[PDB]
Description:
4 copies of one chain form a homotetramer.
Chain A: E1 2-5, H1 13-22, E2 26-29, H2 37-46, E3 50-52, H3 61-65, E4 72-77, H4 95-122, E5 126-131, H5 146-164, E6 169-176, H6 187-192, H7 194-203, H8 212-224, E7 234-237
Parallel strand pairs in A: 1-2, 1-4, 2-3, 4-5, 5-6, 6-7
Helix pairs in contact in A: 1-8, 4-5
InterPro entries (chains A, B, C, D): NAD(P)-bd_dom_sf (IPR036291), SDR_fam (IPR002347)
Family (chains A, B, C, D): Belongs to the short-chain dehydrogenases/reductases (SDR) family.
Protein name (chains A, B, C, D): Halohydrin dehalogenase
Amino acid sequence: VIALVTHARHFAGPAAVEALTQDGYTVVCHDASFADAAERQRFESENPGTIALAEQKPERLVDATLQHGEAIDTIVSNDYIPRPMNRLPLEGTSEADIRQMFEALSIFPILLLQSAIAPLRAAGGASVIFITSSVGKKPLAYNPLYGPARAATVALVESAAKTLSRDGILLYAIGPNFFNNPTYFPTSDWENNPELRERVDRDVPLGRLGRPDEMGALITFLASRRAAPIVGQFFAFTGGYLP
Amino acid sequence: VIALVTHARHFAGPAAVEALTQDGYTVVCHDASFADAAERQRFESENPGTIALAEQKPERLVDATLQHGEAIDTIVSNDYIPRPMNRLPLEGTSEADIRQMFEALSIFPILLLQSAIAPLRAAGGASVIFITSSVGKKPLAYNPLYGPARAATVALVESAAKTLSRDGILLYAIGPNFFNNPTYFPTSDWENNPELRERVDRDVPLGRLGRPDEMGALITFLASRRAAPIVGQFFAFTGGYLP
Amino acid sequence: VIALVTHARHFAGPAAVEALTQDGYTVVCHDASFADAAERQRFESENPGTIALAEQKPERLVDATLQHGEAIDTIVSNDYIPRPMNRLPLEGTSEADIRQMFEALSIFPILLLQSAIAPLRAAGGASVIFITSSVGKKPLAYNPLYGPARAATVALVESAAKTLSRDGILLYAIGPNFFNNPTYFPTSDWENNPELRERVDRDVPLGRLGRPDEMGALITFLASRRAAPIVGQFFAFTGGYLP
Amino acid sequence: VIALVTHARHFAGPAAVEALTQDGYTVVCHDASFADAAERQRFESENPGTIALAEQKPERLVDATLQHGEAIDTIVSNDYIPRPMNRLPLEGTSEADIRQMFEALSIFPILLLQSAIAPLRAAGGASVIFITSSVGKKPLAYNPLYGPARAATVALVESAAKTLSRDGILLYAIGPNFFNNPTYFPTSDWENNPELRERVDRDVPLGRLGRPDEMGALITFLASRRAAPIVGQFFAFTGGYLP
C-alpha cells in the first residue's frame, strides 16, 4: 500500500513519513533535493519503507509514483515556503516573491491534485490531505501574502471535495500553527528562544508546541478512511489557538 | 478505562457505545429510560461492557459515574431533542418548547461540563466530546430554534477549551447531518423515503448517510488523545454537505 | 416613522437612539428602569423624539409600541447582561446566573422576534437588528457563558432570515467588541484603566474604541434597507479585532 | 474627491460608478477597453463625472489616478474573470487558465493594493473595497478554481487590515452572488431564463437578484468611513443565500 508525501524533508514531511511508514505504508517521497541521486540514496537509507522520487514537476509526481505500485492510497500535499518568506509584508515585497508564494502554496498543489483525479478515481478512491496553515482560515498580521496563498488551497479543498467525494477521493486540509516542525517551529527555536515559549504559554491553550507524532496520528486517521463523513473540511492543528 | 455516554439510546449514543466498548472502554451510560431498573438490566444484557446509571440530573452524572471507577477518560455529551421538535418554527411555537430546546441542547451540556471540571482535572485530564449538529455552525431554514441552541453548545466548546485545554481536559464538538442514527435519519427512513434519497443525492458529496461506525471511529480517535492539537474545534460530520 | 430600541440606556441603546432620532425616527424605548414613571420622564426629557415604554415583557413590547404608530419600520434588539456577569466563568457559576445569561441574551430576543413577525409582515416588512457581540462568532476565554448565549442569537438571525427575508423582514446581527458604550467599555474604563488602553493598542487594528456615532451609522444604514442583499449575516464591529 | 474604480465596464463596475459619481465623487476608471482612445472618450461622454484611464498595469493605476487629484479617497478593486471561465472545472483545465484565474483575481489586486499603501497613508487614509464573490468564503461545486482565487483576496483583506487600519487605510471585501450585473447575472439572462428565475426562488431568501443600486449603497456607505469599526471583514451580498 503506497502513499505519496511531497516536500518530504520539510514542514510536515518527517511527521508524515514516520507515521505512515509505521502504519505499514510504502511511502513514495518527493523533495526538491531528490533531483540529486546521492540525496535519494541518503534518504531511503535513513528512512526505511520509502522510495525517493527524482521527479520535480507537480503534475508528474503521480505517474512517477505509480511506477512503484498499482495505486496510490494516500497523498499528503505537504506544501511550504521557507522561513522567513512566510512573513513577507506587502510593502517592499517584490512581484517575483509574490508570484513565488502562490506558486509553492497554491499552484503546485492544484497541479498535483488535478493530475491525481483520473488515477485515484479509476482506483476506486483515495485520500488527499493538504498541509496548509492556520492562516488558510484565520488571518495573522505578519502573514499578508502567506495567508492569501494558504487560503486559496483550503478553498480548493472545500470546493473540489464537493464533486470528488462522490468518486471516493476524500480531500482534507490541515491547518497548523505552533507545530514543532523543522520549517516553522524547530526544536532549537523552542529550546533557544524564550520569546517563543512566552508566546505559547500566552496564546496556545494546550500550552505547548504540537508534536510531530500527533501530526502523524491525524494523518494516519484520515488516511484510514474510517471517518469518511468528515470529508472536505479544514482541521485546525494549533493547540486551541484557533478558532 | 471508563467513558460516560449520555442519552445512550438516542442520536449518536448507539454508535458511541459500540465503538468505545469495542475499543476496550467500560462505558457507563446515561438515558431517561434508565430510571427503570428493568430497562437498565436489559440494556446491560444487550450491551456487554456497559454499566447503566439510574441518575437523571446532568450535574450528578459524573459523581454517579465515579462510583464505578477511579476516573473518567472520556465523556460523550450526546445531547438531543426528539423529532420533530428539531424542526419547530418560530411562529406559533410556545414558550415552553423554546425553553425545552435550550434546556436539552444547551443548559444540560453546560451543567454536565461544569460538574466535570474538578474531577477531570484532578485526574490529570480527559476528553469531552459534544455531539451537536451541523446547524451549530451553518443555518438551515427549517431549524430556527434547534440551530440557536446547538450554536450555544458549539460556542461553549470553543470558549471553554481556551482555558480547560491547559488542564489536559480536551473539548471537541461534532456536528452531524445526514448521519444514519435512530433519532434524525433512521434506516427505515433511508429505506422507504424517496425524498431523503433525493436530498442526499443532491446535497451530500459523499452520496450516502454517514455510518454509525464512522461516527464511532471519530469518537474513539478523539478519545485516544493521539491528536491533541486539534482540541477546541467543531468537526462537520456531513459527508461534505458542510462547509 | 417608528423604531423600537430595547434596553435603551445600556450597551448600544444610546448609540441607536441618538442616531435613529437624528435620522427622523420617533424612537420608542424599552428599558428595565422605565417601570418607574419619573425615569420615563427624565429619559424623554433628556432624549427628544423618544417615547418611553413601561412594558417589560419581551412578547409585549411590539403591541405597546403599536399604540403610538401604525407600524414599526425598525427594531433594534439591544440585548445585554448586567456587567460584570459577561465575564462569569464556567466553573463555580450558579445555575441561576447561567439561566439568566440565556434569559437576557437569547430567550428575550426570541420572544420579541417571534412576537414581531405577524405585524411586521402585515406591514409589508421592516428591519430587525440584534446587537449581540464578537463572541457571537469568535470565542474569548473570559466569556464562556456570555459567548454561547450570544452565539444562539447570532444563529437565530442566520436561520430565521432564510424565511423572513421573503416577507421583507430583514434580520441582522452586529457583534461589537471594544465598542465605547456605557456598559462594557465606558469612557470611565478607558480613562482609568491603562491596561485596557494597552490591550486596545496591541489588539485592535483601528487602535481605538469604536465610537457611538459609528454604531449609530451602521444601524441607521441597516434601517434604511438601501442594501437589503446583505440581509441575514453577522457584522463584526471591532475595529479589525475579528476575524 | 476622487474614487478609483477598476474594470469599470464589468461586474460591479457599473454599480460603483453610478453610486460614487452620484455621491459627488470624480470617479477615475480603469478598464481593458480604455487602451483604445475612442472607447475612453465614448465612455467619458456617457458617464459624466468619470475620467477614463489608458493605463492597463495594476501597479500603475494609482499614479495614473493621481495625475487627476491630490489624493484617492476610495479604491474599488472590482476584479473579475469573464463568464464562463468562472465555472472552469478542476479536471482538464489548462495550466494557462489556472494561472489566469489567479492573475485576474488575486495577483492583480495584490499589486494594486501594494502600490496604494504609501500614498494612501501619506494622505491620512482612504478606503479600499474589494469586490470578490460568495465563494470567497463558502465553496460552490462549480467554482473549484474561481473559488480559490477569490478566497486568496478575501484572505488578503482580512490579514492586511490588521496593519493598514492603524494608518487609516480601511479594507473591506464584498462577496456577491445572485447580484444583477453584466458579467454574472445580466438582466437579459434574468428576463429570458425561467431556470434562473426558479433557482433564485428556491435559494435566495430575498427572492430576487440584488440590485445595482444596493451594491452602490453598500459601496457608498463603506467609502464614507462613517462606520470605520467594521473594517477588515467580508460582507456577503447574496440576498441571504449565505451564510
